[PDB]
């Protein structure tokens, strides 16, 4: 949704665009550099770690700076496309037998840029990212649960999270072939995957808060499964371990885990309902 006007949010100097235009062959490389800087800036903004309410203003601030320089380039493209169109028209009046087609705005690419513009755009995004990093440092000093873990601390926290998720996966495997509870199992798996992130680049458990909320989210997701199927949550669930329980690689192990898990559900009482993370009802 577009609601704001970012047209006066650029730090590029009004006169920079009237300087010396750079040779087209060198231009292309400067535009790709700019594109890359924006990508990198937006990527820092999106980092999972910063998806906490306390970074809201630091982020809005950085976003406003990135969109502002983006808008600068977008408006420059618009102005130049208009001039291009009139040039194309003139070219046609001079080579009437030409078959070349006028580029659309979306095919067009910026043809004019000066080093002053490139340097100012570049410096502006750099300064914006720097301010963002300072705002972040300040934020994290006044909220210890947001402070990044050391690598050892992160490894330990990440293992607790992964272990809980693997218990969730066991429950999922124990009921994915049960006609009565299949949908609940499938959603459990899908929800556990969603909070963890892509297997190849999962959300890092980088501070006390993420460790704490990820654990509660995982516990709640498992409890959602039992609440919805009407089954009782066992106190003991063997954590799923691919090397020991893979459905295809270790059928026996897989079947033993399913069996052990289904049985523990059967023997569980409903005490667990009085202690759930979420309020049900």
């Amino acid at each position: 949704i577009v609601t704001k006007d970012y047209s006066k949010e650029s730090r590029v100097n009004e006169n920079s665009k009237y300087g010396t235009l750079i040779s087209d062959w060198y231009l292309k490389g400067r535009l790709t550099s700019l594109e890359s800087q924006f990508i990198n800036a937006l990527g820092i903004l999106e980092t999972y770690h910063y998806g906490e309410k306390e970074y809201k203003d630091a982020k809005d601030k950085l976003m406003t700076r990135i969109l502002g320089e983006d808008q600068y380039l977008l408006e420059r493209k618009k102005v130049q496309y208009e001039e291009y169109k009139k040039l194309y028209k003139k070219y046609k009046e001079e080579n009437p037998t030409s078959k070349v087609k006028m580029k659309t705005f979306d095919q067009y690419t910026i043809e004019d840029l000066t080093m002053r513009e490139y340097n100012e755009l570049t410096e502006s995004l750099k300064s914006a990212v720097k301010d963002f990093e300072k705002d972040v440092e300040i934020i994290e000093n006044q909220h210890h649960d947001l402070k990044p873990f050391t690598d050892e601390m992160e490894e330990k926290a990440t293992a607790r999270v992964d272990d809980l998720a693997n218990k969730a996966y066991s429950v999922y495997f124990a009921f994915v072939r049960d006609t009565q509870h299949k949908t609940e199992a499938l959603e459990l798996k899908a929800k556990v995957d969603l909070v963890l992130g892509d297997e190849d680049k999962p959300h890092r458990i980088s501070n006390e808060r993420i460790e704490k909320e990820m654990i509660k989210d995982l516990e709640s997701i498992i409890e959602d499964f039992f609440i919805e199927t009407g089954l009782n949550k066992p106190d003991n669930i063997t954590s799923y371990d691919s090397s020991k329980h893979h459905y295809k690689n270790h059928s026996e192990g897989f079947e033993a885990l399913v069996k052990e898990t289904r049985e523990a559900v059967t023997n569980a009482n409903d005490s667990w309902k009085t202690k759930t993370v979420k309020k049900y009802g």
Partner: protein, 290 residues
């Protein structure tokens, strides 16, 4: 449920108005003070997030129209020119959300899709005519203060509410601005965004683009000489364009974010799938299946 559609638990049901609601009423100015774009908690409880499971990705918006049905744009599920063709197992819907950067365990509901139904006469190779699709949830989801269905209009509501100048509301987590190269990427919000816009006269919609528009679409947006701005953008597709009826105080989904050229460009308007025009199909689907 069906009877209770369009009445928001955290608003109408509590006799509370949201911050811009009044801007949709015939009597209004708008000066100095301009309200924020962040949605108020529970202000679009029919809001749905269409999510790709892997790699994780917020694909499009959608809307809840019953405890078992979700409405969206067909091009979010099927669009050959971008090699897009998702099937039920490729995704999920996230309902009742506010922030998209975290899982919201107390209000959020994740539903597995049982079946997707794309309009058989969805015209993707030409102009997105009939850009609409339905998704049946495997289980009905329970309503709460954050998850409530919107109403679909009938012939007259559409005839009376869809008039040039009348304003509707569009919500979504899509891009905040058009960018200079498609590559720049996505400038996304963490919180549901809202924008209210006026329906514009068909002749202006038609003259604003070279794409062939049909009666199954309508466009909305401010004109060059209107000063206010705003529009839907990449990622918003499938989201609802709603209107509050002065006759019964209920919210009606008049449209579905469908397409546009760029985002918020002067003399350009966002196009929406005309919901009433495609209601017999919606009804046939819901009545035949589940």
């Amino acid at each position: 449920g069906e009877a209770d559609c369009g009445l928001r638990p955290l608003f109408e049901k509590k006799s509370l108005e949201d911050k811009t609601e009044r801007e949709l009423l015939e009597s209004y100015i708008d000066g100095r003070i301009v309200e924020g774009s962040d949605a108020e908690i529970g202000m679009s409880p029919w809001q749905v997030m269409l999510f790709r499971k892997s790699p994780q990705e917020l694909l499009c918006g959608a809307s809840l129209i019953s405890d078992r049905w979700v409405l969206t744009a067909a091009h979010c599920l099927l669009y050959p020119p971008w090699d897009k063709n998702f099937t039920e197992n490729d995704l999920l819907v996230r309902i009742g959300k506010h922030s998209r950067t975290r899982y919201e365990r107390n209000i959020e509901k994740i539903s597995m899709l049982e079946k997707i139904y794309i309009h058989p006469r969805y015209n993707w190779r030409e102009n997105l005519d009939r850009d609409i699709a339905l998704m049946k949830l495997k289980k009905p989801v329970a309503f709460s203060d954050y998850i409530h269905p919107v109403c679909l209009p009938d012939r007259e509501t559409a005839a009376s509410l869809l008039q040039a100048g009348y304003k509707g509301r569009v919500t979504g987590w899509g891009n905040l601005k058009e960018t200079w190269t498609a590559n720049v990427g996505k400038g996304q919000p963490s919180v549901l965004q809202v924008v209210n816009l006026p329906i514009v006269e068909r002749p202006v919609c038609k003259d604003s683009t070279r794409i062939r528009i049909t009666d199954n679409m309508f466009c909305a947006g401010y004109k060059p000489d209107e000063g206010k701005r705003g529009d839907a953008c990449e990622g918003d597709s499938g989201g609802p364009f709603v209107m509050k009826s002065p006759f019964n105080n209920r919210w009606y989904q008049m449209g579905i974010v469908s397409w546009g050229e760029g985002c918020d460009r002067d003399g350009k308007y966002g196009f929406y799938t005309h919901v009433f025009r495609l209601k017999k199909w919606i009804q046939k689907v819901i009545d035949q299946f589940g």
